[PDB]
Amino acid sequence: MREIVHIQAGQCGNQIGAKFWEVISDEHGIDPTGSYHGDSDLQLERINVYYNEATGNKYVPRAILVDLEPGTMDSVRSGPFGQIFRPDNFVFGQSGAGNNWAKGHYTEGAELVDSVLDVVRKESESCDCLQGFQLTHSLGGGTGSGMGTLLISKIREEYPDRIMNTFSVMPSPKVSDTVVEPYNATLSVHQLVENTDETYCIDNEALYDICFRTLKLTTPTYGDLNHLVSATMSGVTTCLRFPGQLNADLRKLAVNMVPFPRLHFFMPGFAPTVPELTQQMFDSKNMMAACDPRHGRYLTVAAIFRGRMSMKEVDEQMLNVQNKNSSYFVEWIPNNVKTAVCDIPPRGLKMSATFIGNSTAIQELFKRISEQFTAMFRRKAFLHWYTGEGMDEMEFTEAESNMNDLVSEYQQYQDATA
Amino acid sequence: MRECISIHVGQAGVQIGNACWELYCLEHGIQPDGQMPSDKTIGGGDDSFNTFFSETGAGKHVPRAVFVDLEPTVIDEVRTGTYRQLFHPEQLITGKEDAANNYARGHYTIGKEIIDLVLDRIRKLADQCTGLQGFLVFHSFGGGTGSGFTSLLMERLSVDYGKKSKLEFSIYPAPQVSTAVVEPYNSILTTHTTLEHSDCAFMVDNEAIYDICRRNLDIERPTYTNLNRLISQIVSSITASLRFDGALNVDLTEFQTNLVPYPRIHFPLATYAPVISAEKAYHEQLSVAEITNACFEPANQMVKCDPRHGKYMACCLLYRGDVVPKDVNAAIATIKTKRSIQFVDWCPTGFKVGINYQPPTVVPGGDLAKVQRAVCMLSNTTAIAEAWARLDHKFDLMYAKRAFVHWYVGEGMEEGEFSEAREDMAALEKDYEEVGVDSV
Numbered sequence: 099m100r101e102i103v104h105i106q107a108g109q110c111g112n113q114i115g116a117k118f119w120e121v122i123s124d125e126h127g128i129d130p131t132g133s134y135h136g137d138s139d140l141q142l143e144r145i146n147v148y149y150n151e152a153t154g155n156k157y158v159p160r161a162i163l164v165d166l167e168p169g170t171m172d173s174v175r176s177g178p179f180g181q182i183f184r185p186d187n188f189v190f191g192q193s194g195a196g197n198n199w200a201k202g203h204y205t206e207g208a209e210l211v212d213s214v215l216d217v218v219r220k221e222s223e224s225c226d227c228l229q230g231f232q233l234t235h236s237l238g239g240g241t242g243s244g245m246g247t248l249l250i251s252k253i254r255e256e257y258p259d260r261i262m263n264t265f266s267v268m269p270s271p272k273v274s275d276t277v278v279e280p281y282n283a284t285l286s287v288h289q290l291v292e293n294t295d296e297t298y299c300i301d302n303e304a305l306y307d308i309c310f311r312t313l314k315l316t317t318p319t320y321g322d323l324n325h326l327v328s329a330t331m332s333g334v335t336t337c338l339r340f341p342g343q344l345n346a347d348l349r350k351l352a353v354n355m356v357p358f359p360r361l362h363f364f365m366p367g368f369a370p371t372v373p374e375l376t377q378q379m380f381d382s383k384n385m386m387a388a389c390d391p392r393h394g395r396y397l398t399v400a401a402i403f404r405g406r407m408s409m410k411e412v413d414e415q416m417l418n419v420q421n422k423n424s425s426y427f428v429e430w431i432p433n434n435v436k437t438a439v440c441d442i443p444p445r446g447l448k449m450s451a452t453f454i455g456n457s458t459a460i461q462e463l464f465k466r467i468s469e470q471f472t473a474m475f476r477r478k479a480f481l482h483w484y485t486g487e488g489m490d491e492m493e494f495t496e497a498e499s500n501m502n503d504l505v506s507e508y509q510q511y512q513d514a515t516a
Numbered sequence: 517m518r519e520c521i522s523i524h525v526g527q528a529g530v531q532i533g534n535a536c537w538e539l540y541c542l543e544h545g546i547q548p549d550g551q552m553p554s555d556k557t558i559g560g561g562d563d564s565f566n567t568f569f570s571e572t573g574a575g576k577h578v579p580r581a582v583f584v585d586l587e588p589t590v591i592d593e594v595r596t597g598t599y600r601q602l603f604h605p606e607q608l609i610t611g612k613e614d615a616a617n618n619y620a621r622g623h624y625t626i627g628k629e630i631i632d633l634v635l636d637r638i639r640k641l642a643d644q645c646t647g648l649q650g651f652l653v654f655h656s657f658g659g660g661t662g663s664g665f666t667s668l669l670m671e672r673l674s675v676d677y678g679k680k681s682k683l684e685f686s687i688y689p690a691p692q693v694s695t696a697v698v699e700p701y702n703s704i705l706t707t708h709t710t711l712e713h714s715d716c717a718f719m720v721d722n723e724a725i726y727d728i729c730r731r732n733l734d735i736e737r738p739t740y741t742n743l744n745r746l747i748s749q750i751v752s753s754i755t756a757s758l759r760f761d762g763a764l765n766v767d768l769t770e771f772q773t774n775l776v777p778y779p780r781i782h783f784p785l786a787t788y789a790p791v792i793s794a795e796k797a798y799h800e801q802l803s804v805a806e807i808t809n810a811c812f813e814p815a816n817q818m819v820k821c822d823p824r825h826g827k828y829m830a831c832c833l834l835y836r837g838d839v840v841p842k843d844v845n846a847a848i849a850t851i852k853t854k855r856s857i858q859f860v861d862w863c864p865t866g867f868k869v870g871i872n873y874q875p876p877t878v879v880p881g882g883d884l885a886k887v888q889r890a891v892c893m894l895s896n897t898t899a900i901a902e903a904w905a906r907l908d909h910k911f912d913l914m915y916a917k918r919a920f921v922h923w924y925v926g927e928g929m930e931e932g933e934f935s936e937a938r939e940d941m942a943a944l945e946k947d948y949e950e951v952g953v954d955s956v
């Protein structure tokens with residue numbers, strides 16, 4: 099009875115979240131109508147974490163769909179699992195955000211934010227013991243970034259003692275389709291650094307490379323990329339959704355993954371013999387964030403293996419990776435690599451592994467955005483679009499300072515010794 | 517509803533509007549009488565094509581457009597033309613006497629008689645909108661109506677609608693294509709009066725479209741119909757994102773935010789590819805990467821200038837048709853490797869992209885061949901300052917001797933407005949030089 103309230107905002111948030119509900123609905127064996135037609139009772143032991151039990155034994159996700167542009171709502175509602183969701187949980191506007199963070203955070207999103215919190219109060223009050231919230235959104239746009247972080251700030255006011263998770267698609271180093279994304283990303287990161295307990299960094303360029311270089315898709319699409327992200331989201335939340343040797347929640351994950359409150363930005367991975375999975379799983383080629391783990395040290399790591407597989411074999415292989423490449427792990431957090439196993443594998447797979455790393459190498463990402471942010475901000479390029487919504491330049495300078503301070507923090511523990 | 521109201525001012529704007537709304541009807545399957553068989557949402561709906569068309573209970577799809585001209589000859593043809601019943605009589609506004617190539621007559625003398633009426637009809641269209649997004653204003657620089665009345669309208673729209681988006685489509689004069697001696701004066705006066713009220717202006721050098729039509733389409737001696745049909749392809753590409761549903765399209769706000777780095781620097785350079793005849797399109801297909809490369813060849817720009825000698829500040833690439841993301845990303849990846857295409861150092865990420873899978877449409881009669889993938893690029897480049905310089909020079913030659921100025925003073929203007937408008941242009945030219953200078 100540790101329920102999670104899911105929220106998805108913006109195109110990216112809704113497209114990624116919609117595919118996420120498709121994935122776990124299959125894992126819990128729930129059809130688009132919301133009725134269970136599975137085989138094992140282990141699919142239901144912890145189903146109330148992500149679903150409400152409705153009259154007629156229909157299952158309804160604790161999902162809240164948000165955007166300032168109604169177009170993406172209609173796509174969700176007409177998608178494979180469109181009619182699963184609660185009609186009243188579609189909270190949308192008509193104006194859109196125009197890739198403008200200020201519109202999403204201060205004007206257009208501020209008009210709609212209360213309506214979203216009202217839907218949150220419904221869901222949260224209908225929870226035996228509310229555990230926390232999870233958000234899926236992009237940082238480069240205006241709604242998921244600007245309004246997304248506004249929703250986070252408001253939720254922390256009502257629920258200051260609850261856990262806030264996010265799955266944030268970050269700007270990629272070379273692939274971009276938004277000219278002002280450095281402004282939007284830097285403004286969002288300064289919000290995420292303060293009002294989130296855990297943030298999974300997702301990079302579309304890395305996801306595209308996997309789809310193209312590895313999976314051999316000659317014409318990858320956002321559907322293919324979303325499938326990879328959804329597969330990772332299911333893998334991360336496997337322990338929250340299924341029983342097993344591990345009985346842990348989101349707060350325990352944060353307590354053990356975050357040695358310092360601001361450094362809570364994780365590097366996700368996914369794979370694909372047991373030895374070969376652990377080899378893949380730690381590979382740069384399998385990392386969902388555009389940062390080389392070899393360019394830093396892991397503060398903490400979490401690995402989840404799924405499917406019938408030799409436990410002792412995994413333990414030996416994991417322990418080998420730690421001891422073999424121990425120079426990439428901080429020496430002052432003893433036993434900072436923990437592993438969990440679940441008997442239920444995903445669809446069309448016999449074995450799978452999900453990776454969650456709190457690596458100091460993630461500062462490379464915040465370096466990039468800072469340098470891109472400064473190049474535009476020095477010349478106040480495109481700024482009038484933000485000051486026109488009522489922002490002041492000082493709010494831009496503060497975000498620049500904070501993300502540089504965050505970058506400064508990461509470098510501190512990347513060279514710390516015992 | 518994200519509606520957009522089109523305003524077509526003067527002969528050029530009206531005649532350009534004739535080609536655009538003809539194309540729109542062909543792209544949406546709307547018949548000359550306004551009936552749209554494929555539309556089952558009779559009397560209304562939230563469809564994407566309702567941003568430009570309103571519905572009536574009788575199944576009539578009516579353009580959200582106003583046509584204004586100070587003389588009736590041009591709009592009279594619309595009232596008796598093939599799309600005569602597409603529009604409503606109230607939407608086709610005309611006076612009896614034109615501005616006579618005089619900005620002052622269009623702005624001060626003949627314009628005042630009709631401006632209050634025009635705003636009322638625009639008001640009537642606005643009241644029918646649930647979420648009006650902005651205005652599209654089609655006009656020439658050279659004509660007295662297109663220059664003088666448009667300026668008047670833009671100022672009045674800012675008072676009655678505040679900061680609501682206002683985008684222009686402006687015809688930059690050229691000696692090849694039926695220009696007049698005083699058109700440099702009108703262009704400078706209207707640009708200065710409209711600079712502070714327009715959020716994004718799309719100039720089209722009439723010499724550039726004359727050349728493209730004469731070279732790419734092998735039309736020895738282009739007509740206004742040949743030019744307007746080409747212009748409508750660019751207008752269609754820019755508004756396709758608004759008239760059609762899609763997951764990868766660029767709405768106006770998204771469109772303006774990623775293309776205008778500073779309020780005054782809002783004159784993107786438009787290109788379209790492929791512009792090709794049927795004879796050449798026979799047994800010939802061009803790919804995504806090919807049309808992407810053509811967008812950066814100065815020979816295809818809608819305004820004559822040399823991007824190679826300037827710097828890019830933002831590029832918007834609107835693909836349409838049989839275009840897949842993988843090809844788009846590869847084609848743009850190549851452009852970023854080309855050191856021949858220089859971006860300002862304060863634009864680390866300078867590409868906005870979109871795809872509209874609806875295929876390009878050709879007027880049955882329009883020299884363009886029907887292709888399957890097309891791209892319209894809109895780039896904010898310093899090179900566009902070259903067009904300002906050419907026009908500013910022609911202004912200086914005449915104004916040094918005060919040639920023709922008496923025609924404007926007779927209508928109530930002062931020579932001070934001429935120099936003020938010229939100084940604003942001088943600041944703009946210096947502005948384009950400043951933004952192109954490398955950072956410290």
Ligand SMILES: COc1cc(OC)c(Cl)c(-n2c(-c3ccccc3)cc(=O)c(C)c2-c2ccc(F)cc2)c1
Nearest residue numbers: 273274275302303306319320764841845848869870
């Ligand atoms: C993030 O900025 C982008 C820039 C870009 O071209 C410069 C593209 Cl094609 C995409 N993009 C699009 C798309 C987006 C906006 C307009 C049109 C198409 C759709 C799509 O399904 C996929 C997979 C991608 C994509 C993602 C990550 C990559 F590494 C490579 C391609 C994204």
Ligand SMILES: Nc1nc2c(ncn2[C@@H]2O[C@H](COP(=O)(O)OP(=O)(O)OP(=O)(O)O)[C@@H](O)[C@H]2O)c(=O)[nH]1
Nearest residue numbers: 526527528531614615616617656658659660661662
């Ligand atoms: N592309 C294009 N340009 C046009 C067209 N008609 C006129 N022009 C341009 O417009 C200029 C002449 O001004 P007009 O727009 O025709 O004059 P007006 O707006 O009707 O104002 P008046 O002075 O009162 O006649 C010329 O320099 C032409 O280059 C047209 O149909 N297509």
Ligand SMILES: COc1cc2c(c(OC)c1OC)-c1ccc(OC)c(=O)cc1[C@@H](NC(C)=O)CC2
Nearest residue numbers: 616617658690691692693694695696697698699
């Ligand atoms: C009465 O009908 C005429 C009216 C005009 C013109 C003209 O001579 C071609 C006429 O024939 C008699 C004309 C005058 C010459 C101009 O420059 C000297 C000009 O730019 C202006 C032109 C005409 N405009 C154009 C594009 O030819 C408009 C004025």
Ligand SMILES: Nc1nc2c(ncn2[C@@H]2O[C@H](COP(=O)(O)OP(=O)(O)O)[C@@H](O)[C@H]2O)c(=O)[nH]1
Nearest residue numbers: 108109110113236238239240241242243302320
């Ligand atoms: N994975 C994924 N990323 C997306 C998708 N759509 C947009 N993005 C990312 O988000 C950015 C655009 O922001 P957008 O999603 O439109 O944000 P919004 O304005 O809040 O809706 C791009 O740079 C992409 O990297 C999608 O369908 N899938």
Ligand SMILES: [Ca+2]
Nearest residue numbers: 193205206209
């Ligand atoms: Ca409002």
Ligand SMILES: [Ca+2]
Nearest residue numbers: 212213215216
């Ligand atoms: Ca309330």
Ligand SMILES: [Ca+2]
Nearest residue numbers: 557560561563
């Ligand atoms: Ca309709």
Ligand SMILES: [Ca+2]
Nearest residue numbers: 558559575576
């Ligand atoms: Ca109808």
Ligand SMILES: [Mg+2]
Nearest residue numbers: 527587614659
């Ligand atoms: Mg006329």
Ligand SMILES: [Mg+2]
Nearest residue numbers: 764765766767
């Ligand atoms: Mg978009």
